[PDB]
């Protein structure tokens, strides 16, 4: 059994989200398929389902803008949601209904959807030096979309690193990362913050040096 969502990734608010779930190893005429999403703010939410028989059921809070259909012969289930708003940003999954148990058993890997009007924007990378061990940092501010990858000394320095989840500010993402090294290694030895933003094809190598 295998379900796989195929979706747009980025969607602008007010527009719509279409996702195709292609299944293998079983027949849609034998098992219903559910759609569920997951976001930090709302946890797991069931959106609706299309039963083996072909009828559908929807979560009342979405029915006005949600539609699910399928093509039994092509083993594909189609999900379409309109009038997306920022809080529709989430991971969307299709999952098989395990017949009479009415529990989802096989899940697709999920497709991440970001609802935003923001345009691709590379990050501003600022070095964070202090004003025994020493903690240095890096602020990666104002980028879009996710994700960016932060490494230290091009990946050579991996222990003592804490890269924090990005947060949204003014519709752009900002995140920080800290590394802690023995004070006898910095600034005597070079410490660099390495940032990559795939979407804008940019990389930044910011050396961390003392202030003033």
């Amino acid at each position: 059994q295998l379900l796989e969502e195929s979706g747009p990734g980025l969607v602008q608010p007010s527009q719509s989200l279409s996702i195709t779930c292609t299944v293998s190893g079983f027949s849609l005429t034998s098992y219903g398929v559910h759609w569920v999403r997951q976001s930090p703010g709302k946890g797991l939410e069931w959106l609706g389902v299309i039963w083996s028989g072909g009828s559908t059921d929807y979560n009342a809070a979405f029915i006005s803008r949600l539609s699910i259909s399928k093509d039994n012969s092509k083993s594909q289930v189609f999900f379409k949601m309109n009038s997306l708003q920022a809080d529709d940003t989430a991971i969307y999954y299709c999952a098989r209904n395990r017949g009479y148990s009415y529990a989802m058993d096989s899940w697709g890997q999920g497709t991440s959807v970001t609802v935003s009007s923001a345009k691709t924007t590379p990050p501003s990378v600022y070095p964070l030096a202090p004003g025994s061990m020493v903690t240095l940092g890096c602020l990666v501010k104002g980028y879009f979309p996710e994700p960016v990858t932060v490494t230290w000394n091009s990946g050579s320095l991996s222990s003592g690193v804490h890269t924090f989840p990005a947060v949204l500010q003014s519709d752009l993402y900002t995140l920080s990362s800290s590394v802690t090294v023995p004070s006898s290694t910095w600034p005597s030895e070079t410490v660099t913050c390495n940032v990559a933003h795939p979407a804008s094809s940019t990389k930044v190598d910011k050396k961390i040096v003392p202030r003033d």
């Binding site: 529990a103 804490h162 995140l175």
Partner: protein, 217 residues
Amino acid sequence: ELVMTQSPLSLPVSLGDQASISCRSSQSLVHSSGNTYLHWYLQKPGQSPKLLIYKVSNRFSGVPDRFSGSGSGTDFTLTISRVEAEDLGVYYCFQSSHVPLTFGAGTKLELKRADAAPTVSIFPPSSEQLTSGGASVVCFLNNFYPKDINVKWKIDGSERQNGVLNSWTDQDSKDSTYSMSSTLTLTKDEYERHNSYTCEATHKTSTSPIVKSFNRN
């Protein structure tokens, strides 16, 4: 509506202990067919939820016997007789007896360890960012436990709650601690307008808060 209340929200355990997670519904989950469609799922980071127990107490395929479900009507409990590292994650109850089908808010099964105070470091805006016309003051609170912690920002002795953005890491794989990052965002004029910046961390490991400051000079 049909609300699913999962308890507790966080459940710290030591490998080997028994763990019990509860789920209570605002209405009976006995469906008109006579079946009770209450299920349990376990979700790990970066993964989709995995089914453990279906219809109250039926272990799903490939689920070790240490897991068992019980309960009826509106009260349900999932039990792990002897917790193993691979059991760590977030557990969710799911009911499909009433439409809309709903999930509980989840219970995080986490690993306990000795309490640990946060290592706090404060950072003034980089001159690079200052040149750009902005100002962010950053504070890291690293490797602490438990995860409950309070961070307060003070500008010239005055507490600031607006313009603060916080981010937290998941329980660390090697030492089981948590870390947090807090950023005070200001306009450059605001920043240049004050001198003393303080990051104050209050954690149970100490009656006294940990204070880190700098003076723009």
